[PDB]
PDB file of C-alpha atoms in Angstrom:
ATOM      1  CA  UNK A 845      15.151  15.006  20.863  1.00 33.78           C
ATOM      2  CA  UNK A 846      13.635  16.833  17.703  1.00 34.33           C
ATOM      3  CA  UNK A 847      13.706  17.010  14.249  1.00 35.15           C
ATOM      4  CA  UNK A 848      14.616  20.494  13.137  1.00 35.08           C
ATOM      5  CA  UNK A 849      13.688  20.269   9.385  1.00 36.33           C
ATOM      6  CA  UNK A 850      10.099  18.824  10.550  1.00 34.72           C
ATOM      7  CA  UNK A 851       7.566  20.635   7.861  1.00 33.64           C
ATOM      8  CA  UNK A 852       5.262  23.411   9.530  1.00 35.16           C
ATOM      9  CA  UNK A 853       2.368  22.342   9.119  1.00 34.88           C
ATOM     10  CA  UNK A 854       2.604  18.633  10.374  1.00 34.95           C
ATOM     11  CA  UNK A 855       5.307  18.080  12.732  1.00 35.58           C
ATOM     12  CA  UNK A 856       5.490  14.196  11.999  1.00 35.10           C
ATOM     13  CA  UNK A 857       6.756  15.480   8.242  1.00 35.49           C
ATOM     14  CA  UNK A 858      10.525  16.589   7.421  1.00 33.64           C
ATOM     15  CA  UNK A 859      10.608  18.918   4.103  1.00 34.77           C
ATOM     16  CA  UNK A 860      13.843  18.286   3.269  1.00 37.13           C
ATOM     17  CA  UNK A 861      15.722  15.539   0.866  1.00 39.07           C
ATOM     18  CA  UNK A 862      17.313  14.286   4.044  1.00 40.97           C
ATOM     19  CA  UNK A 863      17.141  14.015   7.699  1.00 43.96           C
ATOM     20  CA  UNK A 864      18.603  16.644   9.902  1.00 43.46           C
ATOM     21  CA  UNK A 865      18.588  15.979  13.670  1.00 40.23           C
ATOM     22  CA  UNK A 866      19.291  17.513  16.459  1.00 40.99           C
ATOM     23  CA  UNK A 867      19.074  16.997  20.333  1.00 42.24           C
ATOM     24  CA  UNK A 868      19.880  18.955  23.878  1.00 43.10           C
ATOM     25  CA  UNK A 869      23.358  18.033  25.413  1.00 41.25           C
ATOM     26  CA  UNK A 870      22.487  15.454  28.201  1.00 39.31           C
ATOM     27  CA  UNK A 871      23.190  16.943  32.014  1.00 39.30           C
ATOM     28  CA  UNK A 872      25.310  16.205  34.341  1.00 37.88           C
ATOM     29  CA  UNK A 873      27.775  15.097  31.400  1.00 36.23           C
ATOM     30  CA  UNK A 874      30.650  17.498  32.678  1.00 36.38           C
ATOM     31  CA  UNK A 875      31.706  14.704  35.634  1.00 40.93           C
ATOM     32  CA  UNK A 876      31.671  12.147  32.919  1.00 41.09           C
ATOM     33  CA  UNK A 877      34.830  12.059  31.261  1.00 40.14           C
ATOM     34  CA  UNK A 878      33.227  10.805  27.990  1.00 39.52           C
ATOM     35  CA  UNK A 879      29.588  10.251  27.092  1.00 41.94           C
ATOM     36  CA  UNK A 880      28.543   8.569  23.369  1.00 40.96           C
ATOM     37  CA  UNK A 881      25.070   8.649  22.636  1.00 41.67           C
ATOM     38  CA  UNK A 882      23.638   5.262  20.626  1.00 42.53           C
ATOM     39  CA  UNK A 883      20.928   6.518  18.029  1.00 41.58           C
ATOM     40  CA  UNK A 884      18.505   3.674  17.226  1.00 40.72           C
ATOM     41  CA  UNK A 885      16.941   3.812  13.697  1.00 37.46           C
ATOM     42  CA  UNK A 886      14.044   1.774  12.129  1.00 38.65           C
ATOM     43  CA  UNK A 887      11.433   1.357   9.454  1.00 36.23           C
ATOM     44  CA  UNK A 888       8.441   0.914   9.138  1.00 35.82           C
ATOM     45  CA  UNK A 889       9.064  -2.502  10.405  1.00 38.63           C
ATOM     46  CA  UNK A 890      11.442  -2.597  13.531  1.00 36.94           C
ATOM     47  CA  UNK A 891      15.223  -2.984  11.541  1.00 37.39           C
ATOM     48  CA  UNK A 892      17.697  -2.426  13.449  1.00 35.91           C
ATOM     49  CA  UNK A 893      19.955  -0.006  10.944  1.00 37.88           C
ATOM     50  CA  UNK A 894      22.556   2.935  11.157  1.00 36.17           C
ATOM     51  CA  UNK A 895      23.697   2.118  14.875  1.00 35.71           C
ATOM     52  CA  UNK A 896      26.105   5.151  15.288  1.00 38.09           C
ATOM     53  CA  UNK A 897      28.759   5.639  17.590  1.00 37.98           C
ATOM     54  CA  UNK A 898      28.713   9.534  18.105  1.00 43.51           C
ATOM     55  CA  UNK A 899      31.077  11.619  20.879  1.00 45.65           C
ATOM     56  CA  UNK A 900      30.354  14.998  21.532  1.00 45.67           C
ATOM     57  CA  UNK A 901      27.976  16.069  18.580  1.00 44.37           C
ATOM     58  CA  UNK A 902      24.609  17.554  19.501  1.00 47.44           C
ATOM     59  CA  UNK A 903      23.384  17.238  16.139  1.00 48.34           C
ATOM     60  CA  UNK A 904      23.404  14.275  13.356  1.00 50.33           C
ATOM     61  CA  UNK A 905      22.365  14.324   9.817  1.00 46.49           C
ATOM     62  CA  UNK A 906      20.824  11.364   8.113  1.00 49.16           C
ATOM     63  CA  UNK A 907      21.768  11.453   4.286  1.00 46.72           C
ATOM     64  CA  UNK A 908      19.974  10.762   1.551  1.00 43.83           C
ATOM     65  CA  UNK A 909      23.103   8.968   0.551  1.00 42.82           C
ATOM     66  CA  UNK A 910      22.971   7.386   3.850  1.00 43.54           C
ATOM     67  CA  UNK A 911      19.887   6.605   3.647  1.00 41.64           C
ATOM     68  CA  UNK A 912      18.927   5.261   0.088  1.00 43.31           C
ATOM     69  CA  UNK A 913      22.486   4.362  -1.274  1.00 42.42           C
ATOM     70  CA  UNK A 914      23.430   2.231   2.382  1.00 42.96           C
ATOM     71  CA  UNK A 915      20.614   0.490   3.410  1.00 44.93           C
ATOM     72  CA  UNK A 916      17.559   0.852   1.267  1.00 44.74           C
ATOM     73  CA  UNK A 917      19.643  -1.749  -1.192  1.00 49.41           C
ATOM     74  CA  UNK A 918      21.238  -3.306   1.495  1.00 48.01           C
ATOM     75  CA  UNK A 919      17.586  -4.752   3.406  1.00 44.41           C
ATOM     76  CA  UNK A 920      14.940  -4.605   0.341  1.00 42.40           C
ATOM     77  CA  UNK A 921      17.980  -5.725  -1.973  1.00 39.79           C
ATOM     78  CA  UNK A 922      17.233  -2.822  -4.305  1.00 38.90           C
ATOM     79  CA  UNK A 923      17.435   0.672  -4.650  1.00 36.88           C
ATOM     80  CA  UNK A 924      14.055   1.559  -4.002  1.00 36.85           C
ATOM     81  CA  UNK A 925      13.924   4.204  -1.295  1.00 36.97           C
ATOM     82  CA  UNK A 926      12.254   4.203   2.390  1.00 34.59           C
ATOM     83  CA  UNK A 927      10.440   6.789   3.888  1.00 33.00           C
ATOM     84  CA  UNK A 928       8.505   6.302   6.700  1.00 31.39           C
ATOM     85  CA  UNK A 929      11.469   6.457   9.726  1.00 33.02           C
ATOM     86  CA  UNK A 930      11.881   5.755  13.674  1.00 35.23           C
ATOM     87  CA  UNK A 931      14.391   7.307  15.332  1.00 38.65           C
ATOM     88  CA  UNK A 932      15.616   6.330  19.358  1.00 37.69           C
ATOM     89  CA  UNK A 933      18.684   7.798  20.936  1.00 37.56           C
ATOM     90  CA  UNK A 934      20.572   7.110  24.553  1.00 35.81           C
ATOM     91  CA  UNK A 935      23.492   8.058  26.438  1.00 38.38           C
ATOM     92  CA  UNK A 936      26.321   5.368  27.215  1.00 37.50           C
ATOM     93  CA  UNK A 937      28.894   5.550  29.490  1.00 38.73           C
ATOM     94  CA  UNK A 938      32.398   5.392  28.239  1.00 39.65           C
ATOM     95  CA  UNK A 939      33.459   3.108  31.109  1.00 44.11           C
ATOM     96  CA  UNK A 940      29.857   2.770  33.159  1.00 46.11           C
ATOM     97  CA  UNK A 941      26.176   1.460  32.154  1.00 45.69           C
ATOM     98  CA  UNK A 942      23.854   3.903  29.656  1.00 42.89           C
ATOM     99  CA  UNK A 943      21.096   6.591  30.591  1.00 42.20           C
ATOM    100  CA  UNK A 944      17.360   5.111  32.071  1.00 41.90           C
ATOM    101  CA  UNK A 945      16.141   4.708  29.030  1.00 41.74           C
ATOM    102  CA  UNK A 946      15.945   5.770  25.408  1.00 41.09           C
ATOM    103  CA  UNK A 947      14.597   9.401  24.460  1.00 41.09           C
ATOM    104  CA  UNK A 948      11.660   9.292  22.043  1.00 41.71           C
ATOM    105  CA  UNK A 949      11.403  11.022  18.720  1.00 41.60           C
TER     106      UNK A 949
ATOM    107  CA  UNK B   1       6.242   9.357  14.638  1.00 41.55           C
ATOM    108  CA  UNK B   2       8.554  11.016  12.227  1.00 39.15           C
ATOM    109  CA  UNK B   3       7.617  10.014   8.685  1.00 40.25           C
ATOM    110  CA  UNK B   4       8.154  11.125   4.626  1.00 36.53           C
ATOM    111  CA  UNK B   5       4.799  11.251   2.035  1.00 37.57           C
ATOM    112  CA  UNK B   6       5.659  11.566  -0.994  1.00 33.74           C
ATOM    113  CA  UNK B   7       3.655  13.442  -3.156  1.00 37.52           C
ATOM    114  CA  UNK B   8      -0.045  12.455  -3.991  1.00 36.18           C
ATOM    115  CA  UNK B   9      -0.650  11.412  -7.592  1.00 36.24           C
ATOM    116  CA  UNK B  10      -2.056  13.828  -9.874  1.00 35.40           C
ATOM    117  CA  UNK B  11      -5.177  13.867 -11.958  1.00 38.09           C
ATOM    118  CA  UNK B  12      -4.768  15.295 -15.649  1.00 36.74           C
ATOM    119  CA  UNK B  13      -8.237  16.854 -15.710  1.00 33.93           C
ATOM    120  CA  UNK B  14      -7.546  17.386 -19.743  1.00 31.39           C
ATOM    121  CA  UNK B  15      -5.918  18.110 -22.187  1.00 29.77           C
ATOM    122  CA  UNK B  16      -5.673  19.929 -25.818  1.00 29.97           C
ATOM    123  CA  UNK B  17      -3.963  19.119 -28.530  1.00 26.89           C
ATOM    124  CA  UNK B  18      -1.653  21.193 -30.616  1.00 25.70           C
ATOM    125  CA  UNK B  19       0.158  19.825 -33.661  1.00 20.89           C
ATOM    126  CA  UNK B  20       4.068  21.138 -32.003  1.00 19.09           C
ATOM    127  CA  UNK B  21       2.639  22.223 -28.489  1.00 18.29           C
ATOM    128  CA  UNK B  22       0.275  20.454 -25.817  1.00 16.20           C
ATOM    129  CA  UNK B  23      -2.283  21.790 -22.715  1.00 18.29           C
ATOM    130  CA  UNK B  24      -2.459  19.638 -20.119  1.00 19.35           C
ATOM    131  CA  UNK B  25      -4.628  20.484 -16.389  1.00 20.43           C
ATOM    132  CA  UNK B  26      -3.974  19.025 -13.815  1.00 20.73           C
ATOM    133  CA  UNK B  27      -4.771  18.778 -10.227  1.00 25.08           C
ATOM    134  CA  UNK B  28      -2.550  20.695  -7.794  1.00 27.34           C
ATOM    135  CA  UNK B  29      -0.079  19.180  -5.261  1.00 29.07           C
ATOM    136  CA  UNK B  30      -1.237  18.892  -1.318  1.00 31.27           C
ATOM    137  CA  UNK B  31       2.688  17.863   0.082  1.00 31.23           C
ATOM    138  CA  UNK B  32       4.826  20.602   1.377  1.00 34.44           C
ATOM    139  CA  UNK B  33       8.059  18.997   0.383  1.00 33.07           C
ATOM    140  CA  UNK B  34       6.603  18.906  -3.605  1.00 33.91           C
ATOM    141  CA  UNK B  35       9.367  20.528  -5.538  1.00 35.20           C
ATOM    142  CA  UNK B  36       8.847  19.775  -8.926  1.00 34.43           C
ATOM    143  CA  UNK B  37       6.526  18.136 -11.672  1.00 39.48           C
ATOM    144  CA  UNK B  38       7.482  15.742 -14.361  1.00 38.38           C
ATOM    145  CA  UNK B  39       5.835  14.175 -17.238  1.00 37.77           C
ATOM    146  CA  UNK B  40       6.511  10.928 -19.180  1.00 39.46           C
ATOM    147  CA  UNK B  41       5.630  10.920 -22.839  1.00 41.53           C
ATOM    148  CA  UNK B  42       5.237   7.964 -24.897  1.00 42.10           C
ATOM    149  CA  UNK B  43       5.980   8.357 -28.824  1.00 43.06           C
ATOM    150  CA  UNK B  44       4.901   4.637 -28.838  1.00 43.29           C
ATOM    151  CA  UNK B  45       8.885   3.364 -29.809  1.00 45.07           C
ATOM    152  CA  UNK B  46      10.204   5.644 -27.555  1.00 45.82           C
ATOM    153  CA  UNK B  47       9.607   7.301 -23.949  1.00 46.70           C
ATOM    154  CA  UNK B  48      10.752  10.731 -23.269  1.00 46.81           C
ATOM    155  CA  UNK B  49      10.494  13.020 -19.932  1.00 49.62           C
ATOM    156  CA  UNK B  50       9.514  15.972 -19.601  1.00 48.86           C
ATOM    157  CA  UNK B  51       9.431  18.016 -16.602  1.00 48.58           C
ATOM    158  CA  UNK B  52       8.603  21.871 -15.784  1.00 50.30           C
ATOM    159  CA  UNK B  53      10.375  24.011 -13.038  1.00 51.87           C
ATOM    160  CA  UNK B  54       8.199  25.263 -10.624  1.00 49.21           C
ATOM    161  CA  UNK B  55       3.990  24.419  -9.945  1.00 49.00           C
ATOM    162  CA  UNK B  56       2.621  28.146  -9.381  1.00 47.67           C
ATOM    163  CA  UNK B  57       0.211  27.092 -12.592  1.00 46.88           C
ATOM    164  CA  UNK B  58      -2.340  24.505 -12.844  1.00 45.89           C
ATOM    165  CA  UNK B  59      -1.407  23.824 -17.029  1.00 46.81           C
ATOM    166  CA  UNK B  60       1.330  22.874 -18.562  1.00 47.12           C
ATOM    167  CA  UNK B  61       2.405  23.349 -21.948  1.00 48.33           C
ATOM    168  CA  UNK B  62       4.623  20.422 -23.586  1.00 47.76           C
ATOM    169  CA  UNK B  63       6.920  21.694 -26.740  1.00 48.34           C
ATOM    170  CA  UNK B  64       8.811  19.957 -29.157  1.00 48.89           C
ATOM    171  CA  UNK B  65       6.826  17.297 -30.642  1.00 49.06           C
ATOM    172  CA  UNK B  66       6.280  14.922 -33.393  1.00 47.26           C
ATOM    173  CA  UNK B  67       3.460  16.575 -35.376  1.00 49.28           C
ATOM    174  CA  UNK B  68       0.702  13.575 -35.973  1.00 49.14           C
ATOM    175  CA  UNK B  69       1.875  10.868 -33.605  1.00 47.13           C
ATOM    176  CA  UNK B  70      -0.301   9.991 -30.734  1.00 49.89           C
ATOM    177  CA  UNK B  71       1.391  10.487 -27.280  1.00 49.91           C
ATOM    178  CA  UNK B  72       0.694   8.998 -24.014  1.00 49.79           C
ATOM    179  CA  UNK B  73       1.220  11.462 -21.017  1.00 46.95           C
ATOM    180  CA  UNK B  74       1.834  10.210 -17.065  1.00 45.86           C
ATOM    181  CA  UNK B  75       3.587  12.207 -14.744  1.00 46.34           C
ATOM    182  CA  UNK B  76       3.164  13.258 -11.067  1.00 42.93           C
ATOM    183  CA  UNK B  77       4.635  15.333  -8.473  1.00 45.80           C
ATOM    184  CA  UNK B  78       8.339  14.635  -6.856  1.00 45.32           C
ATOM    185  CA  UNK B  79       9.142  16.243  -3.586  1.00 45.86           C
ATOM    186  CA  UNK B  80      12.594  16.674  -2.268  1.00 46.45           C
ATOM    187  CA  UNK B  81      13.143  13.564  -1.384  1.00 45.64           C
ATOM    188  CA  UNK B  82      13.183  12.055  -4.987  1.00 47.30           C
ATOM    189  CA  UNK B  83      16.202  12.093  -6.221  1.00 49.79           C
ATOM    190  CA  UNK B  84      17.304  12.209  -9.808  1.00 48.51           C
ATOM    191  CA  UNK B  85      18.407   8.748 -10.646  1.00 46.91           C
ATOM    192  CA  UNK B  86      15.032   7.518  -8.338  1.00 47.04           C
ATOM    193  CA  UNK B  87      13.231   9.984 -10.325  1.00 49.52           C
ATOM    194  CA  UNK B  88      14.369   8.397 -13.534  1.00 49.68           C
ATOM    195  CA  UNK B  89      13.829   5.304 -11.975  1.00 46.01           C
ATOM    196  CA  UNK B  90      10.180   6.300 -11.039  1.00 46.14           C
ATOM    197  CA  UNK B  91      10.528   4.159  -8.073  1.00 46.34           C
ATOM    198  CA  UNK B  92       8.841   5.836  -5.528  1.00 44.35           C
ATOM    199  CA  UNK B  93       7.217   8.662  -7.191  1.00 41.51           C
ATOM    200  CA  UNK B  94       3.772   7.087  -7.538  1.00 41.48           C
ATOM    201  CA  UNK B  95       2.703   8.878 -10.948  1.00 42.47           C
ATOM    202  CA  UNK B  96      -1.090   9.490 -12.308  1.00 41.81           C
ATOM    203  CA  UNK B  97      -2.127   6.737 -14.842  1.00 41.38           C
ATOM    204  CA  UNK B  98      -1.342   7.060 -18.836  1.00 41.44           C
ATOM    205  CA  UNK B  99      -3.968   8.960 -20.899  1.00 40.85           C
ATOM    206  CA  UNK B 100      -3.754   8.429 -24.691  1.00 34.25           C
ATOM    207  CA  UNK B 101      -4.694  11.526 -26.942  1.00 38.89           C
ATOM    208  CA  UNK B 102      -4.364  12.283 -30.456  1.00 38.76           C
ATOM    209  CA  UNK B 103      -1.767  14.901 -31.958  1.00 41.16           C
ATOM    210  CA  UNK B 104      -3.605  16.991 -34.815  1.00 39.41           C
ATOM    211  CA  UNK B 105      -1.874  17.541 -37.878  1.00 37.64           C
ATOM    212  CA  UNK B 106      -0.442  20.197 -39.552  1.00 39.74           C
ATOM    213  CA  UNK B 107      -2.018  21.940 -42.897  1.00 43.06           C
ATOM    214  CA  UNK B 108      -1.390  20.639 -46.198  1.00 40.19           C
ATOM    215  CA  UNK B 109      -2.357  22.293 -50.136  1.00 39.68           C
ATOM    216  CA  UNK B 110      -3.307  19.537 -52.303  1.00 38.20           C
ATOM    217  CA  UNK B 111      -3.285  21.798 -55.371  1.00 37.25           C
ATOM    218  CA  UNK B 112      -2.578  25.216 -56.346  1.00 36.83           C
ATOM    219  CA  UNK B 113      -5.058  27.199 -59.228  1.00 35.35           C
ATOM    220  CA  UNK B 114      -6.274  30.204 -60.656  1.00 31.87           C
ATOM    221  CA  UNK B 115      -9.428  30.723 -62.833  1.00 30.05           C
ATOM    222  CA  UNK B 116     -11.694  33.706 -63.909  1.00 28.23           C
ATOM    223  CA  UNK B 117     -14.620  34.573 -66.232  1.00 21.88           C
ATOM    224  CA  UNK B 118     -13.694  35.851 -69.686  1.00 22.91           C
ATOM    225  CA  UNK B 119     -15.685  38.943 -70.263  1.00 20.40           C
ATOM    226  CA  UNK B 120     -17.018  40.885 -72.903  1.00 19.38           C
ATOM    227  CA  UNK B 121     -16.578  44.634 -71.689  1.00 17.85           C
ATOM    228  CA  UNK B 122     -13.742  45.110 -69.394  1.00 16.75           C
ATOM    229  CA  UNK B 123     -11.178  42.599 -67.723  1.00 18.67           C
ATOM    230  CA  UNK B 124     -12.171  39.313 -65.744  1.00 16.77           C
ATOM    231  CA  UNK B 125     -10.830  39.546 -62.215  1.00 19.79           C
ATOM    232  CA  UNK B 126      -8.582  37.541 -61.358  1.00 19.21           C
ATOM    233  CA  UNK B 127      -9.078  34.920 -57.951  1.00 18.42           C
ATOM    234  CA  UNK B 128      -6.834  32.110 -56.610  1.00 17.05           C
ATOM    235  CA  UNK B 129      -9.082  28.821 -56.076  1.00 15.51           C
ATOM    236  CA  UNK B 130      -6.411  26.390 -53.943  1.00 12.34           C
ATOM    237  CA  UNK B 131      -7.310  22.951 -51.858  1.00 12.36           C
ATOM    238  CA  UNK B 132      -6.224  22.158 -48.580  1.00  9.75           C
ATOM    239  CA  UNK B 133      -5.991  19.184 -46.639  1.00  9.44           C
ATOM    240  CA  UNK B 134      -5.477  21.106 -43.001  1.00  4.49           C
ATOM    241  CA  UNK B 135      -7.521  20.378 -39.950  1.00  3.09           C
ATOM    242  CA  UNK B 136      -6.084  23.781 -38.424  1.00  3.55           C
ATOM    243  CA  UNK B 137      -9.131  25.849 -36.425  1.00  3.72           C
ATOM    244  CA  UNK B 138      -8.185  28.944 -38.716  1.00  2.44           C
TER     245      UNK B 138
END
């Protein structure tokens, strides 16, 4: 679970305009019939926004048009953008329980 | 852990005054994602921006504007992350506090003349004698 656009210099930074992520294909997901990972983001304060339901994608991309036009308005009521980010991702069964526990940024 | 910054303010460390063109320095940008400068003029009636493709240089120089009107100048650095309706905005940009300067103005003759010594032998030279009203260096 790492963030491919993270700047060189200082891993916790992403150069650019959006956020591009990207994550290892869980194991032992071949006797599974189905496995959708649920991606967790925040804010600075813990909001619960952007709950995805992804199948079979080992990569997501957060929009700046995701992520200004969608949310920024919808929780500070106004366009004004948000920048510092969480990010938490785990596996779910199609038909049983999800992984141990969440991966961490 | 993951995070955005944009980028720092800037300091204008000066600026000179031309009567069409302007110097500004200014301090340099520390954020990788920086990807641009702008500027934010202020005719007093109306605000215009102005902003300069790429930050290799430390000036600027500011063209096009009203000879003898005083200007206000704030701008900053805008990663890639600001977009260009947040940039007009000026939301989250976080630019350097106004600085008020004077714009010279340009020179002016107040009267045009000629005059010369009448002479006994020869010819009296001729010479222009003309006012100004300029404040121009040379």
């Amino acid at each position: 679970f790492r963030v491919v656009n993270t700047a060189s210099g200082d891993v916790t930074e992403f150069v650019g305009p959006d956020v591009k992520l990207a994550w290892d294909k869980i194991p032992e997901e071949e006797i599974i019939p189905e496995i959708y990972y649920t991606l967790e983001i925040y804010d600075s304060q813990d909001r619960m926004l952007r709950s995805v339901r992804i199948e079979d994608v080992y990569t997501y991309d957060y929009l700046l048009t995701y992520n200004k036009a969608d949310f920024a308005l919808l929780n500070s009521g106004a366009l004004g953008i948000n920048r510092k980010l969480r990010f938490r991702i785990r596996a779910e069964g199609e038909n049983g329980e999800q992984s141990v526990g969440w991966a961490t940024i | 852990m993951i995070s955005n910054n944009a980028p720092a303010k800037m300091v204008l460390n000066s600026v000179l005054t031309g009567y069409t063109l302007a110097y500004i320095q200014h301090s340099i940008y520390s954020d990788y994602d920086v990807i641009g400068r702008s500027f934010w003029l202020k005719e007093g009636s109306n605000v215009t921006r102005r902003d300069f493709t790429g930050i290799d240089t430390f000036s600027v120089t500011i063209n096009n504007l009203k000879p003898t009107t005083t200007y206000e100048v704030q701008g900053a650095f805008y990663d890639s992350i600001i977009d260009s309706e947040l940039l007009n905005a000026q939301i989250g940009i976080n630019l350097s506090d106004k600085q008020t300067f004077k714009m010279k103005s340009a020179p002016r003759i107040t009267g045009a003349r000629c005059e010369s010594e009448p002479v006994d032998v020869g010819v009296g030279a001729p010479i222009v004698y003309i006012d100004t009203t300029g404040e121009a260096d040379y």
